[PDB]
Design a protein around this ligand. Structure first.
Ligand SMILES: *[C@@H]1O[C@H](CO)[C@@H](O[C@@H]2O[C@H](CO)[C@@H](O[C@@H]3O[C@H](CO[C@H]4O[C@H](CO[C@H]5O[C@H](CO)[C@@H](O)[C@H](O)[C@@H]5O[C@H]5O[C@H](CO)[C@@H](O)[C@H](O)[C@@H]5O)[C@@H](O)[C@H](O)[C@@H]4O)[C@@H](O)[C@H](O)[C@@H]3O)[C@H](O)[C@H]2NC(C)=O)[C@H](O)[C@H]1NC(C)=O
Ligand SMILES: *[C@@H]1O[C@H](CO)[C@@H](O[C@@H]2O[C@H](CO)[C@@H](O[C@@H]3O[C@H](CO)[C@@H](O)[C@H](O)[C@@H]3O)[C@H](O)[C@H]2NC(C)=O)[C@H](O)[C@H]1NC(C)=O
Ligand SMILES: *[C@@H]1O[C@H](CO)[C@@H](O)[C@H](O)[C@H]1NC(C)=O
Ligand SMILES: *[C@@H]1O[C@H](CO)[C@@H](O)[C@H](O)[C@H]1NC(C)=O
Ligand SMILES: *[C@@H]1O[C@H](CO)[C@@H](O)[C@H](O)[C@H]1NC(C)=O
Ligand SMILES: *[C@@H]1O[C@H](CO)[C@@H](O)[C@H](O)[C@H]1NC(C)=O
Ligand SMILES: *[C@@H]1O[C@H](CO)[C@@H](O)[C@H](O)[C@H]1NC(C)=O
Ligand SMILES: *[C@H]1O[C@H](CO)[C@@H](O)[C@H](O)[C@@H]1O
Ligand SMILES: [Cu+2]
Ligand SMILES: [Cu+2]
Ligand SMILES: [Cu+2]
Length: 539
């Protein structure tokens, strides 16, 4: 045993960075939270607008726990005109499928005025976030940080916490979805760094453009090592995070600690997390913090202003004049060779499932996976179907059945022709990136080039534009697991499928069945007279 400290971050008592957290979990304590999903008004960047929030702030409240703790999170929907459903990003939910928070898959939506208590253990440590998985709501601010303390692969002195990177509209995403769904994501009006940015309201006629937005600011004390927890939570944003004249030591990706590597800039797709350690070893000055919005990935009206300020002297009010590192300027992820899990694991014998992304136009632009666009019924989520002993699901549920070759390699191909790098998120599992390739998948040749020996391992990874992503995971978590592009427009357009894994091995407590039933009962009481019907894929 050793205690975690600034000079022994690898330690976690009897556990450590070498503990297999897929197999072993510390005993912790029960932590209880009450969250209210609210319809709010905020001014994050000098522009006043509506938001959908947890507890009236963007980001929502931090949920901070220790590895092994049991979370009880009472979520009350205080919106009037939407259901909601809260997902705990990257959280494995082993034995707690029904609290994954995917409406249409693991639950019915929480109706206005209802409460759903999510219960789960955190059997993972690091940086993640929680967010609505109900339509585009997280675009309107319905997300917050979820930090699980545990060991780390490099030493550091202070944890500064999360820095959210996002696009930010000056109106509700729900006002622009009808335009967006014609096929083209709109250029949004601004970006936020940890919930703030400047915006020039000086020439504006819009009463809501009140001005006074401020750059995100981060203060460093010289010689101190800081852990920063980077999350891209935009609707349709790509970042290449950098701090001028500072080196990032990358120590985790998503909820998987990695062998540390140094980089000047850090490519981050939507829903991806990185933990980096930054040593405040520069000349004391103000330095630009650069989101480096990927303009080739998607449009924004104020791409150049996706920045913040690092100060070594907090009393400085000067803008930085530092010179940035030339960004790679791509929509890629970090290179696979750089992302080596500290806890080394290999992909065993597998069955290969191949799926192909294309697009179509029905009522509006849709993405398809083997010709089918995901469209879920919020009143008949996949788990309800499973509880009713159904093994054949609607075509548009895009179900792939997995049954145990205890591993699956899932290859998703971009046949769309658009060359977009789609951040693909898999629920219920960390996956192994056996291939992430900019080329055409050849079912006879490509598999022999898969890396099965400790490849990158995480829960969000890019489908390369016009290429393929081959992700492996073990049949170790019975349930119904959504996989989707995390570009909110694309998710809403049906770029998604789901794995019904080991169906007959799913076990739910009567307590949790009653709860699920009750949520669906309340949802069904709501829908007859709702102001708004489902008008997207449901996820
Ligand atoms: C980007 O922007 C975000 C702001 O949006 C910034 O987030 C900040 O991130 C930092 C670092 O990650 C956080 O600092 C840490 O905060 C920890 C918690 O601090 C607070 O809560 C403590 C616990 O309070 C509960 O427990 C005690 C018993 O121990 C009770 O007395 C108390 O009533 C609470 O009980 C309730 O909750 C527990 C579950 O949590 C239940 O089980 C109970 O039944 C009950 O319902 C409290 O003692 C303390 O005084 C604080 O209120 C702290 O442990 C840690 O050491 C550190 O301070 C910030 O909290 C976070 N700020 C926000 C607003 O989220 C972020 O830093 C920024 N990034 C950058 C780079 O600037
Ligand atoms: C959840 O709640 C939001 C309200 O916060 C609903 O948003 C509304 O969505 C409708 C249907 O897309 C929007 O109507 C469209 O608006 C634009 C407005 O300029 C117009 O071009 C279109 O022809 C159409 O009328 C409406 O703007 C929007 N309302 C707000 C306040 O944003 C959303 O539908 C709800 N979804 C669910 C599933 O309950
Ligand atoms: C969030 O807001 C709700 C409703 O006011 C309140 O009951 C709950 O205690 C709040 N939770 C936090 C974490 O502030
Ligand atoms: C949020 O409140 C606004 C303003 O009252 C209203 O237009 C909107 O429908 C509400 N949205 C939801 C999802 O309840
Ligand atoms: C945005 O950046 C441009 C330079 O890229 C700068 O000239 C302009 O004043 C900035 N706007 C805001 C609101 O900070
Ligand atoms: C999807 O279609 C491709 C091309 O026809 C086929 O090879 C693949 O097996 C299909 N996948 C599934 C799960 O049906
Ligand atoms: C589903 O099958 C199980 C196992 O045979 C049975 O116990 C249960 O009653 C069935 N569920 C429904 C909804 O009929
Ligand atoms: C991560 O590591 C790989 C392999 O060394 C490099 O190629 C990459 O540039 C980054 O440093
Ligand atoms: Cu997510
Ligand atoms: Cu996409
Ligand atoms: Cu998801």
């Amino acid at each position: 045993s050793c205690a975690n400290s600034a000079t022994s971050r690898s330690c976690w008592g009897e556990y450590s960075i070498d503990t297999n957290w897929y197999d072993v979990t510390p005993t912790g304590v029960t932590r209880e939270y009450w969250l209210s999903v609210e319809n709010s008004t905020i001014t994050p960047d000098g522009y006043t607008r509506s938001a959908m929030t947890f507890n009236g702030t963007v980001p929502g409240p931090a949920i901070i726990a220790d590895w092994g703790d049991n979370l009880i999170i009472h979520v009350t929907n205080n919106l009037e005109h939407n259901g909601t459903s809260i997902h705990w990003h990257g959280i494995r939910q082993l034995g707690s499928l029904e609290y994954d928070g995917v409406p249409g898959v693991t639950q019915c939506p929480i109706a206005p005025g209802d409460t759903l208590t999510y219960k789960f253990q955190v059997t993972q440590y690091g940086t993640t976030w929680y967010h609505s998985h109900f339509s585009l709501q997280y675009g309107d601010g319905l997300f917050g940080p979820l930090i699980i303390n545990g060991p780390a692969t490099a030493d550091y002195d202070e944890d500064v916490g999360v820095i959210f990177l996002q696009d930010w509209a000056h109106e509700s995403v729900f006002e622009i979805w009808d335009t967006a769904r014609l096929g083209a994501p709109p250029a949004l009006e601004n970006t936020l760094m940890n919930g703030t940015n400047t915006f020039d309201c000086s020439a504006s006629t819009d009463p809501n453009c009140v001005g006074g937005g401020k750059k995100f600011e981060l203060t460093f004390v010289e010689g101190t090592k800081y852990r920063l927890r980077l999350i891209n939570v935009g609707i349709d944003s790509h970042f290449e995070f950098a701090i001028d004249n500072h080196t990032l030591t990358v120590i985790a990706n998503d909820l998987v600690p990695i062998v540390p590597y140094t980089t000047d800039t850090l490519l981050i797709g939507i829903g991806q997390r990185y933990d980096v350690i930054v040593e405040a070893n520069a000349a004391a000055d103000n330095y630009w913090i650069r989101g480096n919005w990927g303009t080739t990935c998607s449009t924004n009206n104020e791409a150049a202003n996706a920045t913040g300020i690092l100060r070594y002297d907090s009393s400085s009010i000067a803008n930085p004049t530092s010179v940035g590192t030339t960004p790679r300027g791509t929509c890629e992820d970090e290179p696979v060779a750089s992302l080596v899990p500290h806890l080394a694991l290999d992909v065993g014998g597998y069955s290969l499932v191949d799926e192909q992304v294309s697009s179509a136009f029905t009522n509006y632009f849709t993405w398809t996976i083997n010709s089918s666009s995901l469209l879920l019924d919020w009143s008949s989520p996949t788990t309800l179907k499973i509880f009713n002993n159904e093994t054949i699901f609607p075509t548009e549920y895009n179900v792939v059945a997995l049954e145990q070759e205890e591993w699956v390699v899932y290859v998703i191909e971009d046949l769309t022709g658009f060359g977009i790098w789609h951040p693909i998120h898999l629920h219920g599992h960390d996956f192994f990136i056996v291939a992430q390739e900019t080329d055409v998948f050849n079912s006879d040749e490509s598999p022999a080039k898969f890396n099965l020996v400790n490849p990158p391992r995480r829960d969000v990874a890019a489908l390369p534009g016009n290429g393929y992503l081959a992700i492996a995971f073990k049949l170790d978590n019975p349930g119904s697991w959504l996989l989707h592009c995390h570009i909110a427009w694309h998710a809403s357009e049906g770029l998604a499928m789901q794995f019904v894994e080991s169906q007959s091995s799913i076990a739910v407590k009567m307590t949790d069945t009653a709860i699920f039933e009750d949520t669906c009962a309340n949802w069904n009481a709501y829908t007859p007279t709702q102001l708004f019907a489902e008008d997207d894929s449901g996820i």
